[PDB]
Design a protein around this nucleic acid. Sequence first.
RNA 1: AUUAAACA
Length: 157
Amino acid sequence: ERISMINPRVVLDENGISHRSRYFIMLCDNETAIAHAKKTSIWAVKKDSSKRISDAYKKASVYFIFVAQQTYNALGYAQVVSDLNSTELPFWSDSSHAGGVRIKWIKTCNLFSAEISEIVSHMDHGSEARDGMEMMYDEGSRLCTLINYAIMKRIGR
RNA sequence: AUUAAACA
């Protein structure tokens, strides 16, 4: 079996994934989409990653972590709070999208962290993250913590 | 406070 190095109580599968809590990266190259998602709390899910995301959502809490494609700036993270909906597409989607999901924003931001950029840079077996991919429990945990730290360091609070 | 959740 396999052990979280962040919280060893968390049971992981052989891919480093927790079946209780699962994390996907959304690499953002479209300012209209992320701003609309920040306003409305709806995200359009790509066909290429929809089945894995809906499979995850059967039993786990599912989170999307938003990163800017060109800079690897963190843009925030959100919990998925509905099933995928073929008839809830936001205006900005296209036929590359499967449907919309409601999200609950946890954090929103636009900032650079060297550690976040490193994690994203190596997320795919040592190579750059792919949009929509599922990351390991420890990657998702550490990214949430790093986003929370950067925003706390702002407020500061 | 824009205080991750889960696990306990």
